[PDB]
């Protein structure tokens, strides 16, 4: 069972996490708009730009985040963004059939499509609850191992608290598979290949430039 503090840490985190909201206007263009490669690309790019903003807002509300060096806050955001976006998109596909097809027919090299979608299977089969997603996304964001972080040990201090909570909460929600916690950390490993190959997916993507915020957070 959770401690008094661990329970307040969760409600804080969960309130920042339930404030993640995509606009109705952006989700409105999921059946309305036509079904072309060039049109599918534009939508994803708009969503992904809004997603980074929302994720950036969520990231700031995490315990102790603004105490980190300013330039480190940017190192964690660029280092983690993709992996956080993959987690949030897996939560979408395991709770959709148009979004999946838009992604499929938006000029991505085919190499990247199947691996991407079997990742979403692997995640769905863990049967994660809202709180397990919100904790995994925060643990991914506060990963000390990213490039260009000066004060590593500071980032490790903020992350560790959250690992205790998710371990206990995994044995609460899923006592029938006592290795469910470790399996989540297995996806932390697997998210790193997607991060590593994300630069080349972007530069091989077929188009007629993304958006400045996405150009910043992934580089040009």
């Amino acid at each position: 069972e959770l401690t008094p503090d661990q329970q307040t840490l969760l409600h804080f985190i969960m309130d920042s996490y339930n404030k993640q909201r995509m606009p109705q206007e952006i989700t409105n263009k999921i059946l309305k708009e036509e079904f072309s490669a060039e049109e599918n690309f534009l939508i994803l790019t708009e969503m992904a730009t809004n997603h980074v903003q929302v994720l950036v807002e969520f990231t700031k509300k995490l315990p102790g985040f603004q105490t980190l060096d300013h330039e480190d806050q940017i190192a964690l955001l660029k280092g983690s963004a993709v992996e956080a976006m993959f987690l949030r998109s897996a939560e979408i596909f395991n709770k959709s059939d148009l979004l999946e097809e838009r992604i499929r027919n938006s000029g991505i090299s085919d190499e990247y499509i199947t691996p991407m979608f079997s990742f979403y299977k692997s995640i769905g089969e863990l049967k994660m609850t809202q709180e397990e997603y919100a904790l995994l996304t925060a643990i991914v964001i506060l990963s000390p191992d990213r490039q260009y972080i000066k004060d590593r040990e500071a980032v490790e201090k903020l992350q560790e608290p959250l690992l205790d909570v998710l371990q206990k909460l995994c044995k609460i929600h899923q006592p029938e598979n006592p290795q469910h916690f470790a399996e989540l950390l297995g996806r932390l490993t697997e998210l790193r290949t997607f991060n590593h190959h994300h630069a080349e997916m972007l530069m091989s993507w077929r188009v007629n430039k993304f958006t400045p915020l996405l150009e910043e957070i992934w580089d040009v």
């Binding site: 903003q53 950036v56 700031k60 509300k61 603004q66 300013h70 806050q73 940017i74 955001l77 400045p212 915020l213 910043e216 957070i217």
Partner: peptide, 15 residues
């Protein structure tokens, strides 16, 4: 500068 928009967004704060 290099991270123009991210700087601005990280310098805004609570809701």
């Amino acid at each position: 500068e290099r991270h123009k928009i991210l700087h601005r967004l990280l310098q805004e704060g609570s809701p």
